[PDB]
Design a protein around this ligand. Structure first.
Ligand code: SF4
Ligand code: SF4
Ligand code: FES
Ligand code: FES
Ligand code: FE2
Ligand code: FE2
Lengths: 633, 633
């Protein structure tokens, strides 16, 4: 089982699933081998009913699509659609919070409110929305209106791109026509230009992909902005992770998916239904996190993370998961059938994300507290039904220090320099105590032993004094392996990085250091890393493509991950991906994305499946940036 | 070659291509056989980097996607994306005309103007835009603003759905949540809900598809509305079709693609550059049509149609095609490489639709007349370069009576009843002279011998007195085989239908009948058939799902075709498709789309690859509707 997952809790549940006959994600993968080579290389097109068309990577015919579409067009078209799909998920998430915020301050849904007034006013200022003399509800109305306005064409480009990157970066992108005109506008244009008989030039197609990836960035940043207004900007918090956070004697409720509009309410309402769970024989209601909705409520509330990504089914296999409350994205639809075996009540809540065999509860903000209690009552019902059935919770969990929003990082650094808080970080980059910055982002992928690339790469970078930050299921990986516990700083961190984490921690009154990896939140909160990196760029007076900052989608899976990796490249970052995207079928496309794009945006993809090699390549990328700034390395 | 195409001109050029070594669409198809069975059945998913996932139609594993996605989810997700892609093409076309119209009446692009004031005022009234006391430029501003507004969420649903179908049909669709909220909004929502780990219920997924197909309808109808304002509502016109319209002694210029914003200007400017072509040794400039841009300028100006769809390369093979002027959609990218062999200058003009090896001319409305002359001068240059090279134009063409906009049909029928023009048509449906109505729409498909399904089905329906109308490449097929020449009415038409076409023609002063098939325009002009059918519904006081009207995408190809077929079903029509869409891998999905959907919208797909059987099935569908109205059949 260590070939399936490096996580010992997951291993334990895989043995349980095997003796019980419950098929897993790993079993379905084995049954899919060998996977289709045309798909894997990207040399397959089904964009019209003349297909499927495929192209032999090598050999004789077929060499070209029926309509004349070459390998390089086919590959670029498939990649563009995946970016557009990722953008559609992140911007749909954001759009929904915009409507939620609009409803809140119009009196429609009193369960929602402006919780972070500072953030609301700073977003308004960033957007140009007057705040002087306005009521908060009216500024917030203007911010939600502006959020919704960025989805379509208008007299301005997308403001959640042009106001969040340095003018120098916006100018670079504008010269190449890469600023998005509207978020859903770019999604649609991709689907059009990639449809049969339209765009058939690889460079033109990929320029479209870059622009649509910036539409995805805009949705990410909008989602983080709006969720912070509504639910509070994260600050440092201590909690726990992995399956051992499940409690046999409690009603265990997993919140799973991406958008926290529901599960933030679940968190608060659960705390009151406490005596009602006690009446059913439980100690209380134990909300635990799965995937990015879990990250959201861990970041803000310290809700413990149960598991992540590829291993999500394993939470159910314990026998103690009474309820799994779903919104959308990254939810294995196998969960609905596994619940038949495990007794877990699986509940969908979003109209466009249903799963056959799951109970649906039609969430509406206007009734959130009521929907919350209906769900938690179904969970209390399931806890009652497993009286006297033994459970198998692996007694395995890690301590997790999380909550490092960009505002939190700046405040933590402010304790070392009050009026210039980025300077202590830059100082230590210059002097070498911090070699660079690496953002780990993205999913697990069944093709990679779970977490093996994240932990292998992170270990090698931390030993070389790289400041490591993490979001989404990359942060999930690192937390489950102890990388967010400050007691592991001695083991994991190089001397210089240890010195910096220690200095910052001691100055924030904790007598111990910051944890080895900084948890910056969910997938949309990759926008927070952009905020930090752009603030560094502006404080230094250079563009992002001169900074010793890189990103790693070390175990990428979702179309969202492809979109993030692409806008990481587009804002100027060297960007590693540890799984093969479907591009190897075209050398010209590969060469654009890993080399030529450097001359456009300054960033580039680093495709490397071997994690020890990937780290060496990321460190060379960091050290090249150091050398370009005239720093020792 | 009769196995490749039923068109004798195409046959002639296929022999030429063969002896000259020029690879065709048919050669690339042969080289692709056998095509992938998983693709063909829809049992393949590449929506994340854990794939490609496939499912064996039958046998042993793989039975399910790696993430747990079943056959029915995978099939419904693939189909939803194709609908969203089709919607993206038709609505992108429409959006571009909206911006063109806005520019026109703001003084920015004097080459464009309000040409059909009646249409502008009727659209304004239909939308609720005040016209009383307004300048035309201001009404037109309001119409373009409203067009652009339908792409995003707002306080109203998409008006180019809710104002163009009967209240009874809107109510049926609203009850099931199928009214689109915004055109690009629905495109994005599809791409989101179909992304990994989101919607996983076939019925929910397909309900999303229906709604997004209505977004496609809205873009179609918006495109027709705006193009009519800008370029004139079609009225009956006489011209010619097929390769014999090429002229060795002229500069032959094909306009090819879908959006006529450019080629309408090409048409007019060519007429003046006449003496400049004479100076180069030509008789003049002969603009000819390919695909739906060709249809647009045939409908409005009588420009002759050269060819269509699958056989577009064959125009170049004559040796006399000096220039092919491209916008977007349905353009085989092989044209760019074939031009090396044929000498044809291939020119792209739209920023999001480039082809490697083609000359690009950056069209902008603000400079259209100038861009027009630059292009036509490149074409005059190519004519000069083929002095003394023999050409092989097949001496084959048909006479084409076209221009049957819904306004034109109503006016033609008004000559038989001035104040109730739909009544003469209904009268003859009731008495049986008109058995029903069949709309042929969509593309050719290399899988089907070119035009064989269109002509086989049309012949059998015309003999059974069905009124036949046609758009897009279905109309292209029928025109090239003589179905738009009134001299073929005796041969082709049943006695009762002949009587009606004759009565209407004689009453419009032509001493002969209407042609056997009514050409209603391009693909977006499938919206015109909706206008006619909805007007019939309203005049009769019943919903469209009670009318003896059906549609046939007899040789479907493009994702646009899938979107049209789906909204034909969604507005209540029995809808034949003559090529296999990728749905047979899922019986439950097939059963929804061909049977259960009837209980939602009243329409349904008829999947039938054998054209004689398809016609029998369409006639049974017509006759069932007749019986439901209590009419003999
Ligand atoms: S778009 Fe071209 S390459 Fe793709 S399936 Fe259709 S014919 Fe084949
Ligand atoms: S979305 Fe599911 S079925 Fe599709 S490729 Fe990914 S794992 Fe396979
Ligand atoms: S041939 Fe396998 S992905 Fe299409
Ligand atoms: S396996 Fe052939 S279409 Fe994917
Ligand atoms: Fe996630
Ligand atoms: Fe077309």
């Amino acid at each position: 089982q260590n070939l399936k997952s490096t996580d010992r809790a997951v291993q334990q549940m895989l043995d349980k699933a095997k003796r019980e006959g419950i098929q897993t994600v790993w079993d379905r993968y084995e049954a899919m081998k060998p996977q289709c080579g045309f798909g894997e290389t990207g040399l397959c097109c089904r964009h019209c009913l003349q297909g499927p068309c495929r192209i032999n990577p090598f050999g004789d015919e077929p060499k070209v699509g029926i309509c004349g579409a070459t390998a390089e067009v086919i590959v670029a078209r498939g990649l563009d659609r995946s970016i557009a799909a990722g953008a559609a998920g992140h911007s749909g998430h954001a759009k929904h919070l915009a409507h939620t915020l609009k409803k809140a301050v119009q009196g429609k849904a009193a369960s929602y409110m402006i919780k972070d007034r500072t953030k609301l006013h700073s977003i308004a200022k960033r957007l140009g929305i007057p705040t002087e003399g306005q009521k908060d509800e009216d500024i917030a109305l203007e911010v939600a209106k502006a959020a919704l306005a960025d989805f379509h064409e208008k007299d301005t480009p997308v403001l959640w791109v042009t106001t969040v990157l340095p003018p120098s970066r916006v100018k670079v992108l504008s010269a190449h026509g890469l600023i998005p005109a509207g978020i859903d506008h770019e999604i649609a244009e991709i689907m059009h230009r990639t449809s049969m008989g339209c765009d058939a030039d690889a460079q033109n197609l990929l320029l479209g992909g870059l622009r649509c990836s910036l539409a995805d960035l805009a949705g990410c940043y909008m989602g983080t902005d709006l969720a912070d207004i509504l639910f509070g900007t994260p600050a440092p918090v201590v909690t726990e992770s992995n399956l051992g956070v499940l409690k046999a004697d409690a009603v265990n409720v997993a919140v799973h998916g991406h958008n926290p509009v529901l599960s933030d309410i679940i968190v608060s309402v659960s705390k009151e239904m406490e005596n009602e769970a006690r009446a059913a024989g439980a100690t209380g209601i134990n909300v635990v996190g799965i995937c990015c909705t879990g990250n959201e409520v861990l970041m803000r509330h310290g809700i413990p993370a149960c598991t992540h990504s590829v291993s999500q089914e394993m939470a159910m296999i314990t026998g103690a998961l009474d309820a799994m409350i779903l919104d959308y994205q990254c939810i294995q639809p196998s969960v609905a059938t596994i619940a038949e075996c495990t007794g877990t009540t699986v509940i969908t809540t979003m109209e466009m994300s249903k799963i056959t065999g799951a109970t649906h509860v039609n969430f509406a903000e206007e009734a959130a507290v009521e929907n919350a209690k209906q769900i938690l009552r179904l969970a209390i019902d399931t806890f009652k039904r497993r009286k006297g059935k033994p459970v198998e919770i692996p007694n395995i969990k890690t301590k997790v220090v999380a909550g490092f929003s960009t505002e939190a990082i700046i405040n933590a650094l402010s304790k070392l320099n009050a009026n210039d808080p980025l300077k202590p970080l830059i100082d230590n980059v210059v002097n070498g105590n911090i070699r660079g910055v690496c953002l780990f982002a993205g999913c697990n992928n069944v093709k990679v032993p779970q977490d093996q690339n994240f932990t292998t790469i992170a270990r090698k970078l931390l030993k070389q004094n790289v400041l490591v930050v993490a979001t989404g299921c990359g942060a999930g990986a690192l937390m489950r392996h102890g990388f967010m516990d400050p007691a592991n700083v001695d083991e994991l961190c190089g001397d210089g990085l240890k010195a910096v984490l220690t200095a910052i921690g001691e100055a924030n009154g904790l007598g111990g250091p910051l944890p080895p990896v900084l948890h910056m939140g969910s997938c949309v909160d990759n926008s927070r890393a952009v905020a930090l990196v752009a603030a560094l760029a502006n404080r230094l007076g250079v563009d992002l493509d001169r900074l010793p900052v890189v990103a790693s989608a070390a175990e990428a899976m979702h179309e969202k991950a492809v979109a993030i990796g692409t806008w990481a490249v587009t804002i100027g970052l060297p960007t590693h991906i540890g799984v093969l995207p479907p591009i190897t079928g075209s050398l010209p496309v590969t060469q654009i994305l890993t080399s030529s794009v450097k001359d456009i945006t300054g960033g580039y993809f680093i495709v490397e499946l071997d994690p020890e090699t990937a780290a060496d390549k990321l460190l060379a990328a960091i050290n090249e940036r150091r050398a370009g700034l005239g720093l020792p390395w």
